[PDB]
Amino acid sequence: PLEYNSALYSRIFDDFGTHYFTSGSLGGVYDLLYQFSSEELKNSGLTEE
Amino acid sequence: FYNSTWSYVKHTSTEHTSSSRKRSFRSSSSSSRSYTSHTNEIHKGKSY
């Protein structure tokens, strides 16, 4: 609408957002996490009478 | 994962011996006894 209406204008930002890119770099992003745990127990008894 | 192993050995040995000799007449009596109790246990658990 030519007349101001806050809802219908706000739809613009909903659909298209507020800003556009004037400069940018495009690329790839690699993210890795590796986590390891080991627990080891040994026991050996002898009793003789 | 966890991998769990247990081993267990139990041994018991018992002996009894008795002998008697009398002379007067002459007599003898004797007895022997031997014993063992033994147990083995092995128990294991594995989760993945």
UniProtKB/Swiss-Prot annotation, chain A:
Post-translational modification: All cysteine residues are assumed to be cross-linked to one another. Individual modules containing an even number of conserved cysteine residues are supposed to have disulfide linkages only within the same module.
Residues carrying covalently attached carbohydrate according to the record: 47
Subcellular locations according to the entry: Secreted; Target cell membrane
Related illness: Complement component 6 deficiency: A rare defect of the complement classical pathway associated with susceptibility to severe recurrent infections, predominantly by Neisseria gonorrhoeae or Neisseria meningitidis.
Subunit structure: Component of the membrane attack complex (MAC), composed of complement C5b, C6, C7, C8A, C8B, C8G and multiple copies of the pore-forming subunit C9.
Protein task: Component of the membrane attack complex (MAC), a multiprotein complex activated by the complement cascade, which inserts into a target cell membrane and forms a pore, leading to target cell membrane rupture and cell lysis. The MAC is initiated by proteolytic cleavage of C5 into complement C5b in response to the classical, alternative, lectin and GZMK complement pathways. The complement pathways consist in a cascade of proteins that leads to phagocytosis and breakdown of pathogens and signaling that strengthens the adaptive immune system.
Family: Belongs to the complement C6/C7/C8/C9 family.
Protein name as annotated: Complement component C6
Organism field: Homo sapiens (Human)
Organism classification: Eukaryota, Metazoa, Chordata, Craniata, Vertebrata
Gene that encodes the chain: C6
Residues of the whole record sequence present: 346 to 394 of 934
From Swiss-Prot, chain B:
Name the record gives this protein: Complement component C7
PTM entry text: C-, N- and O-glycosylated. O-glycosylated with core 1 or possibly core 8 glycans.
Similarity comment: family membership: Belongs to the complement C6/C7/C8/C9 family.
Organism whose genome encodes this protein: Homo sapiens
Domain of life: Eukaryota
Subunit note: Monomer or dimer; as a C5b-7 complex it can also form multimeric rosettes. Component of the membrane attack complex (MAC), composed of complement C5b, C6, C7, C8A, C8B, C8G and multiple copies of the pore-forming subunit C9.
Subcellular location: Secreted; Target cell membrane
Cited function: Component of the membrane attack complex (MAC), a multiprotein complex activated by the complement cascade, which inserts into a target cell membrane and forms a pore, leading to target cell membrane rupture and cell lysis. The MAC is initiated by proteolytic cleavage of C5 into complement C5b in response to the classical, alternative, lectin and GZMK complement pathways. The complement pathways consist in a cascade of proteins that leads to phagocytosis and breakdown of pathogens and signaling that strengthens the adaptive immune system. C7 serves as a membrane anchor.
Low complexity bias (residue ranges): 25-34
Species lineage: Eukaryota, Metazoa, Chordata, Craniata, Vertebrata
Glycosylation sites: 3
Entry's disease: Complement component 7 deficiency: A rare defect of the complement classical pathway associated with susceptibility to severe recurrent infections, predominantly by Neisseria gonorrhoeae or Neisseria meningitidis.
Region described as Disordered: 20-40
